[model samples]
Target: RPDLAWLDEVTMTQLERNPYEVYERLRAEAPLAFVPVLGSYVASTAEVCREVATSPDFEAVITPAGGRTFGHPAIIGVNGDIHADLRSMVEPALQPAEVDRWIDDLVRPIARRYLERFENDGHAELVAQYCEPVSVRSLGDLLGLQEVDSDKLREWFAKLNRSHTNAAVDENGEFANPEGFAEGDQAKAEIRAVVDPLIDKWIEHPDDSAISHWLHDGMPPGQTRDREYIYPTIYVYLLGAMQEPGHGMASTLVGLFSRPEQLEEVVDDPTLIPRAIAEGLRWTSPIWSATARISTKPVTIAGVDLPAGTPVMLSYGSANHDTGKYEAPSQYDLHRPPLPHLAFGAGNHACAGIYFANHVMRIALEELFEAIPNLERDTREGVEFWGWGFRGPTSLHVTWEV
Candidate 1:
C-alpha cells in the first residue's frame, strides 16, 4: 500500500495563505509523494515540474468536471497529438507579433481611459476600477467579443476557474461539488452570448483579428468557431491570460506606491518596468498555483514513484521562490533579468500570452508613473479578494499625484 502521509500536511486553505513553504518542504522530502485523497502524487521540484510539462510519459488530459470540459478544449490540459492540434489552431493570436498589436490597439487605450479618470483624486480601488475591466476588455477585443459585458465576463472567468480547482477536492477533500460541472456550462453560455454575436459581426465584416480568422479561415473540418466551442475556447484563454498578470501588475504598483524609493528608481529608468513585472510575478504570484496534472504510468520521479494516474500540482508560487533557481528568491529585485521566471510556467506549454500580458502591464505602469507621478497605496485601506482560484485583489486602494 502506498503511503499518503503527505496528504495530512496539505490543505487548500493553508496552501492559499502560503503554498511556497509547503512546496519547498515537499520537494525536499517527497518530490513524488502520492496523495490518495487527491488521487495523484505531488511534484514540487523544478526539474520534476519541467519534466512533467514536457514529457510525453505523462498524460495531460484533465477532466475539469470529471469528463466535462468547456466548449473549446483546454489546449494546455490536452495531451499528445490532440493537444498539439488544438494549440496549433489558437497559437497565432498569442504569438509575439499579435500580442504586440493587442497591447497597442486594445490593452493600452483601455488602461489609459480608466486611469485617466482617477488622475486627480489619485486614490481609489485600482483592482475594481482599472485592473479587472482593462483585463477583460483586452480579452474581449482579442476574441473579437466586443459586444460582451466586460465586467460580467471577468466574473465568469473567476467562477469557472474556481470550479476547476474546487472540483478536485470535496468540501473535506473527497468530492464536494458534483454540480460544479454546471458552472462550466453556465460560463459556456456566457461565452456564447458574447462571442456568437461578435462572430456574426466578424463574418459580416471580416477583419484581420484572430477571432475573425478562426471563424472564417481557421478551425478543423466539421468544426466552426461558433457559440458552442469558439466562445469557450477564447474565454478560457483570455480569462487566464489577462486576470492574473493584470492583478500582478496592479499589485506591483501597489507595492511601488507604498515604497517611495523603489517607485523613484522605476520612474527614473523605464527599463525597470520589465524587471518589476518579473518581480511582481515572482513576489506575489497572483495566480497562486498552476493547473493540476496527473501521471500517465507508474514511474520514478525525483526517486519516488510507483503508479500511474496520480495527481500533481506544480505550485508556481514555490517554483518562483525556489532558491535553486533564483539567487535571492525571497527578495523583490527589479535589477534581475526578466527572462527566466516560472511565472508563466516552463517549457512548451508556457504562456504564449505572456508577451501580451507583459506589454499591457508595462504600458499601464509606465503611463501611471508618467501621468499620476505620485501614486501611493492606501495601506490603511486594502484590497479584499473574493475568489481563491484566481487570486487577485478585488479592490486595491491607491492615491496618486495629479
Candidate 2:
C-alpha cells in the first residue's frame, strides 16, 4: 500500500466543508493521487470511478479498525456468497413497489402534518419541522417499531451520524455515521435489550411489516435470530440512513432559498420538482463520501494498471461534478437529461433506501409548497445549518406575507 501524499489527517468533518473543492482539484492535479492522510488512493475521474465500482475483481469488504463489528444486516458490509444471501434478506423491504406501497399511509400523513404547521404561520424551520422528523419517523414506521417512541428514535438517529467520535471515522480515512448517542456503546446495549424482546414477541405473533417479514422462515423451530445481529443492524440502518436523506432534504430547502429563481421555476412547473430533486441530489450530495473496494487482482483503469488489495474510495460527489460526465458539472442544471448520477452509487451495491429517500424529499417539499406556498425563512439573518453528521440548517425560519 503506497501512501498517497496529499491527504493529511483526512476526517469526515474535513470533507464537510465543500468537499467537491478538494475533489475537483484532485481531478485536475492528481486523478489517481494518493493522500497520506487517507492512507489510500482517491480517484476523481468519472471513468475511473465508474470502472472501479463495476470491477469484477474488486472486493467490497471493509477492514474495520479494532475489529469493529457491523450493526446492520445490510448487504454492503458483507462480501462474496454471504453478502449475496444477506442482501437478499433485506432487499425485499426496499424494492420500489414495496417502498411505494408503504409511502402513502406511513410517509404522506407525516409530510402533510409538517406542511400544516407552515400553512398558517407562513414561516417555519423547514428542516427541523418538516425534514428530520418525517424521514426518521417514517423509517421507524417502516421497520415495524411498535411502542418505540418517535421522539427518542429521532434523537438516536440524529446522533448516529454525528462526527468526531464513534464509527463515523475509523482507522480508514473515509467514514460513516454514529450508531447511537454520547454513550453510544451503552446506548447500543440498551436499544438491543428493548428490541430483543420485541423481536421475540413479533416472532410469536408475526405480521406483514419488515421486521416480521425478516423472520418469515420460522427461525429454525426453537431458535430465533440473534439480538446482537438483528438489533444493531436495524438500529444502525434506521438511523444511519436517516442522516443522508435529511442532508439532501435540508440542502434542497437551502438551495431553493439561495436560488429563489429556480424555486419559482419549479413552482410554476410542479413536475420539475422531481428533476429538481435529482439535481439537488447531485448538487448537494448528502453523502459526500463512501468507503469502497480495491481490486483484488491487477486491473487497468484509464490506461493505468493497479495491483491487488489497494484501498479505494468512490467519491460520488466528485463523480457527479466530473467535467467529463456533465457539461459545467459544477453548475446545477436542473434539466440535465435525467441520466443516472452517483449521488447514490451505481450497480448492485447501489443504495437500497433510494426510493424511500426520494419519496420523503418529494412529498415533504410538495406538500410544503402546496400547503405553505407563502412559506419563508424564519430567522432574521437566514437559515442556520445544523448538526455535523446529518448536516443542515438548525431551522428554516422564514416569514411569508399573511
lDDT of each: 0.65, 0.64
Q: Give the number of the best model, judged by TM-score.
A: 1
TM-score of each: 0.86, 0.84
Q: What C-alpha lDDT does candidate 2 achieve relative to the native structure?
A: 0.64
List the RMSD of every prediction in angstroms.
Answer: 3.3, 3.9
Question: Candidate 1: which pairs clash?
Answer: 40-310, 40-311, 122-399, 122-400, 123-398, 123-399, 170-175, 170-176
What TM-score does candidate 2 get on C-alpha atoms? 0.84
lDDT of 1 by residue, 1-402 (tens): 245465664666665544566666766676666543344455566667777766666666444442354434566566567567566667787789767654686766877887777777857777767777777777767765666676786777776675665635643645655676677677767666666666777766778677777666555554455544454456566557647766887767755655578878998887789877778777666755546566778877777665687666655656666667778766666666664656677656666677777887887778767776666677787555433334555678776655
Candidate 1, residue 248: lDDT: 80
